[model samples]
Target chain A: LDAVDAILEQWRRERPDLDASPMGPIGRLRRCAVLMDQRLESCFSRFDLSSWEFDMLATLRRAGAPHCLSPTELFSTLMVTSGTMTHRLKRLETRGFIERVQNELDARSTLVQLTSSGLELINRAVEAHIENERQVLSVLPAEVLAALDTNLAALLRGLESH
Target chain B: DAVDAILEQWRRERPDLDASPMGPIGRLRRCAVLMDQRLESCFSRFDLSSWEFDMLATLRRAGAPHCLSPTELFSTLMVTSGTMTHRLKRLETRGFIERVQNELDARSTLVQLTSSGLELINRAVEAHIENERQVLSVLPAEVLAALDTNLAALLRGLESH
Candidate 1:
């Protein structure tokens, strides 16, 4: 399943002068990320959610409230622009998941709230999504996951500094 | 740059649930994305996209006489038949690859890396691996060893699934 060692092996052959120590670890992390993304997409597909739909809904769900945000607020958090956000919002609205409300404070802005159906859907989706992760991660040894988590934390700190 | 901030926010917002599990996963996701962006820049300098480089490199790594069935290529690259078709078409047109008819099975097609393709890959991969080393230079040696071991197991498990 892991193609990294072979990749690492070839690099060592071609670039004998270089350290290349980083190749194996980084390649695995990236490969693992790709697998998780595909698996997560599958999980979301089962709930009839495309990736965009899941992101918008999950962002709202994470807010822990009326499950609402201004369009500006939503797009800002996800780093999407106005036009694309507008399109996604329009689609989600048509899907009966959310509605646009005129921002009372700023007439130029719009507010969005998860509908009752939307709330039910996101709740179920998030629950199922977490369960999916749990199931996938369960395949690995606990000690391995623990070590991975620890190393990742340290790497994050170093990445931030450098 | 730490997602610990976001994890902290989630904990405060959803006190009823444990948010700790997200810490490692989120870090991996973000790191992989950033790593891809940088590595892709290296490939783009050679006029090859990430998928293109990946396909070429995969073929090159398959060892000499460099060819495999289209079915094998698609599965190895984790792309669909349609995507593989378009990709192979482009590479073939560039004279970097060839789609040959398998004589043993007239119905099956074999994909091959041209000499030009092999030369380009060897060059591209040299840059890629060097850039990979730099991108991952921030991590200490011991941590890389531990993470590499852990990631290999998790990756193998997930790939099996």
Candidate 2:
């Protein structure tokens, strides 16, 4: 029994017509995500980076090479809109973590790139971030961890195919 | 293979980095977005948005008299006091909830579900729970049990803070 159990029990008494068994896993997943996000944020703060900052920098770092991408590319990968990306780019630029460069191929447009400092910061942050993710899951049994990854992979495929 | 593709990119770009941890993390976030989209469809059928339904459900679960303080409401719903105030007014205007005088605490009022509010939530919850069942039915029972157990462990670890 957990917090979600209390919620389920309440529903059982109040609305007996409903079977809230499905909510057990779904609610736990959502709650776990929320808590894990907070844990991740603490790691981000150590480097003076927010989750989005870390994400943008890491996305560029993972892209390799010149480590530059257009605003459209960044927004689509980050799951934000073009309008929101504009302000985010501005903020990162102001912090000197990233720069806007003229797109060499299409001079009319611009591209975003992590500054040298940003690249340096993200490399160190990414290492710690990965370690932090591991630490959070270390409490689970090895078999449970493997099963979770497999099940989540299956769920992701199911949702994506839909 | 969306997450797999990401891991492969990391391997090629920065082989020194162990990007394997990203697999579950990325999948969890992606799965949540897809799950919420399905839940939103059910909420939309009743003309209640996610947050609105959440507020009503929080009240409903508290049982009869079906009332809670503004602080309790905001805290449970994880919204700002101002946001809760704004939501309370909106629900009140819709006649789904009413702000009643708090005899126990004369300085502030309490939020109580109107009969209309109770009726709506009772119905919405039934559909919402059924929708969750359908959405999760995509997975096998064994898969769900593993997910539930692991997720419970994860939540317990997180809540220890």
By TM-score, the best candidate is: 2
- Report the lDDT tens digits of candidate 1 across residue range A14-133: 557666666788888888998888988998999999978998987887777877798888888776899999999999999999988787888888899999889889877877776777
- Cα lDDT computed for each candidate against the true fold: 0.81, 0.87
Model 2, stretches more than 4 Å misplaced? A106-108
What does the lDDT read for residue A107 in candidate 1?
80
Candidate 2 C-alpha lDDT tens digits along A31-104: 77777888899999999999898989999989997899999999888889999999889999999999999987
Q: In order, what DockQ does each candidate have?
A: 0.54, 0.77
Q: Compared to the true structure, candidate 1 yields what TM-score?
A: 0.88
Stretches off by above 4 angstroms in model 1 are A10-20, A70-72, A79-84, A104-108, A158-162
